[PDB]
Every structure is written in C-alpha cells, then in structure tokens.
Amino acid sequence: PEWMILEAVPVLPPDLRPMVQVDGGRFATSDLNDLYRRLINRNNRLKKLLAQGAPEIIIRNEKRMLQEAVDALLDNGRRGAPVTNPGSDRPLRSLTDILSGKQGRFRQNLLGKRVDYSGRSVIVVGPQLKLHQCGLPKRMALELFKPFLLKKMEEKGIAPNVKAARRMLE
C-alpha cells in the first residue's frame, strides 16, 4: 500500500497519442496530449517556483492545479471536467475514458473488430444447392481467396511470381 500515492506518472506511448497530418494540412492528435502538457507545464512551473523563492500561497495554489492535472489524464470528470479551448466543451478523453468510456476499450473490445478475410452480399435462395454447399459469387471468392490463388497461379503457368500474379489481377 505505499504505492497508492503518486510521485512518478507513467506516460502513454507516442504513436498511441499521435500527431498527424490531415486534409489541407490539418493535424490531429489524441486528446491525451493536451492533458499531458497540462501536467508537464504545471510540474515544471512548480520546480521553478520552488527554486525562484517560495511564497506559500502561490506554491500551494500551483500544487492544487498540479493535483487536478494528475487527475485529468488518469480520469476526467470525477472532479470537474477539463476542456480543449473554446470549440468543444468536450471532456478530453481521460485515460479512464479510454478503458471504459462511452465507446471505450474493454467495451469495444467486445463490440467487435474487423476480420481480414471477410465479405458480404445480398442473399438469394439456392433450390438445387444441397445443405452441404452454398453459392458464392466467384467475383467475391477471388478477393476472399486472393493469396490462396496467387500462389496457385505460380504452381501453374498463368503467372511467374506473386507480384506478377498480383498485377495480373489488379
């Protein structure tokens, strides 16, 4: 139990809180990053406030902010709700909101993931078909079993190699 107290704040990886180039030249970053800055800025202003000299009121004042901040990344809203500047009165997704949230992690960890070798079309009765089988559009089959086909193309004269067999069907 001495660990419940925080003095070392783990920071989530970078690529998981991207900074990205969009349309026109727009950019986009995981809300987490504005919160992180919150903390780092405060934590630094703190250090410098101690060093410069320290009038009590101001040091606590900051320590308060600091605390608040440390909440923010962990979980937002339990105590007040942080906002990106005037544009969206939106709770910056807190690490918590990431795990649980409206449409969070464990949550959507069970809502669904997208399969790689999938497909979907309209269905239509297949009277002669036997329970055993099902009618599948070749055109669909091709994409579905693309890699299985590629290689099989090479086993026959249709194509010299994979990349070939690929362009052959592009």
Partner: peptide
C-alpha cells in the same frame, strides 16, 4: 470544491 474561489479567498 471549485478551485478558483478557494485561491482567490486564500490570497485575498
């Protein structure tokens, strides 16, 4: 409770 008030009160 709410942070502005408290500091304001604090130094004021």
């Amino acid at each position: 409770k709410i942070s502005t008030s408290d500091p304001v009160r604090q130094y004021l």
